[PDB]
Amino acid sequence: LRDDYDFVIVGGGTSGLTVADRLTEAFPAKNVLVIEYGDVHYAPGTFDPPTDWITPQPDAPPSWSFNSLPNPDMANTTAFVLAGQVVGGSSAVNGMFFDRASRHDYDAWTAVGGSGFEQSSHKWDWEGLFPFFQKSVTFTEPPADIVQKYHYTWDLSAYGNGSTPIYSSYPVFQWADQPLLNQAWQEMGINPVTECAGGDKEGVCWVPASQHPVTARRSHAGLGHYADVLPRANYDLLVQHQVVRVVFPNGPSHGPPLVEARSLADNHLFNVTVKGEVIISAGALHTPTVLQRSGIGPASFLDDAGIPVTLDLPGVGANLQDHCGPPVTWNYTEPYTGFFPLPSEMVNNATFKAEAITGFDEVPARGPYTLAGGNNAIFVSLPHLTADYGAITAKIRAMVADGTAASYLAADVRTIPGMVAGYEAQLLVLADLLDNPEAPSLETPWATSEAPQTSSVLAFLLHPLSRGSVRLNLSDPLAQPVLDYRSGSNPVDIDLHLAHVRFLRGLLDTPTMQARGALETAPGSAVADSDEALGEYVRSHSTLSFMHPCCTAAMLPEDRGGVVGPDLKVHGAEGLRVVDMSVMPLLPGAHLSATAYAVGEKAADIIIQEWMD
Ligand SMILES: Cc1cc2nc3c(=O)[nH]c(=O)nc-3n(C[C@H](O)[C@H](O)[C@H](O)COP(=O)(O)OP(=O)(O)OC[C@H]3O[C@@H](n4cnc5c(N)ncnc54)[C@H](O)[C@@H]3O)c2cc1C
Ligand SMILES: *[C@@H]1O[C@H](CO)[C@@H](O[C@@H]2O[C@H](CO)[C@@H](O[C@@H]3O[C@H](CO)[C@@H](O)[C@H](O)[C@@H]3O)[C@H](O)[C@H]2NC(C)=O)[C@H](O)[C@H]1NC(C)=O
Ligand SMILES: *[C@@H]1O[C@H](CO)[C@@H](O[C@@H]2O[C@H](CO)[C@@H](O)[C@H](O)[C@H]2NC(C)=O)[C@H](O)[C@H]1NC(C)=O
Ligand SMILES: *[C@@H]1O[C@H](CO)[C@@H](O)[C@H](O)[C@H]1NC(C)=O
Ligand SMILES: [Ca+2]
């Protein structure tokens, strides 16, 4: 471990390793150090040997497990959330669903920053982010036989001729009843989309897997941004170390700070000297933890924590958002026939599963295990799924106009004019986005419809108005934070859930599902028809997290509660940036990992262009 470094990156995760990669290749004379809580682990993909249709990988890398506080507005249910504890971060333990949000979701970032963000040239709208999306991954056309078998569609214009060893691929396998819902979504008027990673994604979407096109092995940041670029002499990595905080010897206006690190083996604490900048990429859950212990956070929490205030930025750990939603479930009253193979074949058929195990080891990889978690989702806009009803967005706009919107934030947040102002800007922008018929409001993925385990649809609330907190355990500040999800704390989220579930129920009415005798098992017509009963149902049967927590160090002006500018520097701190999913101001209508790379690539480009002064 060297005397000093030019760059320290806190967290060897998805964004952090892509930043560390791009910095070391651009500045061969500058030394980068990545400090990682975890270690290097082989990363099994989703549904790899010897699992059954979606069982846990026996040799999975380590992760943090989180149980949030009870969410009273969702029947006190707890949210269960994971975070990868490994070189590669969460992308090493992903479900590998590798989509991007619509162009309008990222346009929303620029709009929510407002004019306070406009004397910078770093635009995080679609036009400013799309080139880095193309840079971030290499996509590969599937074989022709696989195309004519499963009917993948795509448009290479969405990917360009990028060549970064982070792979987006379509498996050479699908379950045999994959076309079932595909046909039924079209009978609901949801239309096929040829390519959904090129910004235009409302309709029925093919989504790729973050995995190698030949071997089907998981692609994560630890390979593509770390292992695959070594040897590289200025690219250092320190494992089994927890970065405690950053310290400014002469205050935050004289930087970069020192990185105070704790060795997880022996608890030995030390400091790393930084010449250039410190980049924090500890993730949406842990970046707030690193800045809070650095005295960079809500002044009142920091006082209650016995931590001296270095920067009073109440956005640190605030504005927590995640994807969540309740299900619609059915059985079949006729036998589920004519499909081979279905997922149950893995548990019914030793021959078939033995072959799947060995098919995965052939070159190229073959059979069921080349599949990750599935490659399909609908993304339906609020106008489309409700027949242009303006009730929800009127409620949002009114709730800002009358000033009651603030009441839905936490009691130590609604009192802060900065936070109310930024929450209000979010809601109006979200109100506009949910009025855009090309902007997804509901996501529903599927790969099979075999009953009973996969005869269900989930109603992903893509753009929640509720907001939560990531805060230090005050008993053990170095332990994992407390997550207060406050799911459903803004009531428009419940209205969205009812609209989404009620749209989804139409699935069972489709000729395709009626041919199969699909019989609704939950919520049922009785519940669905009662705003009070369906409300009760979404509040107690929703999954509170699909493991996409974000926006705890939002890219917003300080007066709107943000923590970083559009250059991703922490407001009021020189030589200190954040680059991970905590910087998004609004949660995107997508799974986050592809965005995490794109954010890493653009943040690296920003950092590079300035250090070539
Ligand atoms: C179970 C699960 C499944 C998912 N499935 C999908 C999916 O199918 N599709 C999708 O698009 N997204 C998915 N995601 C989410 C997506 O992968 C993440 O949002 C994204 O990878 C996060 O990137 P990041 O760089 O912000 O964080 P991470 O990649 O998690 O990076 C944080 C890193 O910092 C390290 N760290 C934490 N604290 C410290 C500290 N104090 N000092 C040093 N290092 C520290 C962590 O160990 C980790 O390496 C999933 C997430 C989970 C948890
Ligand atoms: C990492 O670097 C920081 C910055 O140098 C170290 O923090 C500094 O620690 C010194 C202790 O040597 C603190 O000074 C102390 O102040 C109290 C009262 O103010 C006084 O009673 C002590 O005698 C001593 O002078 C100093 O405040 C502190 N600096 C900051 C900005 O917090 C930190 O210890 C280093 N960490 C490790 C593990 O080396
Ligand atoms: C158990 O699974 C194996 C698949 O590995 C089945 O064997 C295949 O059956 C299909 C018929 O759907 C044929 O097209 C293939 O030629 C067979 N391949 C091999 C390698 O056997 C087998 O039929 C399954 N058993 C049952 C009872 O369904
Ligand atoms: C939430 O917390 C506790 C449950 O043990 C109780 O205070 C409250 O009634 C709970 N709310 C609901 C709706 O269950
Ligand atoms: Ca697999």
Side-chain angles (χ1 to χ4, degrees), residues 284-350:
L285 303 178
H286 284 295
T287 284
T289 252
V290 161
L291 298 150
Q292 276 161 20
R293 287 187 307 250
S294 296
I296 302 165
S300 35
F301 176 76
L302 294 185
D303 289 341
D304 281 28
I307 305 172
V309 175
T310 306
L311 293 173
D312 178 18
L313 283 180
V316 172
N319 211 49
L320 172 67
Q321 292 151 249
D322 205 335
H323 287 311
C324 79
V328 180
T329 65
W330 61 98
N331 300 330
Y332 299 108
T333 60
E334 299 180 359
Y336 200 55
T337 59
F339 293 115
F340 183 92
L342 291 186
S344 65
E345 209 66 27
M346 299 292 291
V347 299
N348 291 175
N349 193 308

Side-chain angles (χ1 to χ4, degrees), residues 183-207:
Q183 187 40 54
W185 298 130
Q186 289 174 254
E187 280 158 20
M188 299 177 75
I190 312 169
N191 298 101
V193 180
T194 285
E195 178 61 57
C196 306
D200 295 303
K201 121 181 241 212
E202 198 274 336
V204 193
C205 286
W206 279 115
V207 164

Side-chain angles (χ1 to χ4, degrees), residues 53 97 174-175 177-186 203-206 330 373-379 443-449 454 456-458:
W53 188 259
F97 201 79
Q174 295 288 338
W175 302 113
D177 65 338
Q178 183 282 338
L180 188 93
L181 289 205
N182 184 73
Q183 187 40 54
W185 298 130
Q186 289 174 254
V204 193
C205 286
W206 279 115
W330 61 98
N375 299 95
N376 290 110
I378 51 160
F379 300 81
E443 172 185 341
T444 299
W446 90 93
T448 1
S449 311
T454 46
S456 63
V457 278
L458 293 146

Side-chain angles (χ1 to χ4, degrees), residues 210-231:
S210 63
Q211 67 174 50
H212 194 276
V214 179
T215 74
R217 302 287 190 281
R218 182 196 284 281
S219 184
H220 56 96
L223 301 180
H225 279 305
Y226 177 66
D228 287 6
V229 299
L230 302 192

